[model samples]
Target: KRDKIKEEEQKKKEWINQERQKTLQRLRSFK
Candidate 1:
């Protein structure tokens, strides 16, 4: 159960990072 929870947390972090990068890229192109 602990391993599963850790995996889920990692996945969430990755998803957030991906979204952050997408937003940053969009802002950069807006310049």
Candidate 2:
């Protein structure tokens, strides 16, 4: 029960981090 909740949070964190990194990379090249 508690393990499932923790798993979801971990997934969300990883997804957000990946998205943020991609966005930052794109912003660096904006002209």
Candidate 3:
């Protein structure tokens, strides 16, 4: 059960990173 929770947390972090990169690209495009 603990391992499953850790795995889920890691997945969430990766998703957040992807979203952050997209936002950075969008802002750069505007500038």
| lDDT against true structure, model 2 | 0.76
Q: How does model 1 fare in lDDT?
A: 0.79
Model 2 ranges with Cα > 4 A deviation: 1-8
Candidate 3 displacement at residue 23 in angstroms? 0.7
Tens digit of per-residue lDDT, candidate 1, span 1-31: 3554333477787888999998979989988
Would you list the clashing residue pairs of candidate 2?
A: none
RMSD in Å for all candidates: 5.4, 5.4, 5.3
TM-score of each: 0.55, 0.50, 0.57
Q: lDDT per residue, candidate 2, 1-31, as tens digits?
A: 3554333477686888899888878888873
After superposing candidate 3 on the true structure, give the runs of residues whose Cα lies further than 4 Å from its correct spot.
Answer: 1-8
lDDT of each: 0.79, 0.76, 0.79
Put down candidate 3 lDDT per residue, 1-31, tens digits, no spaces.
Answer: 3554333477687888999889979989988
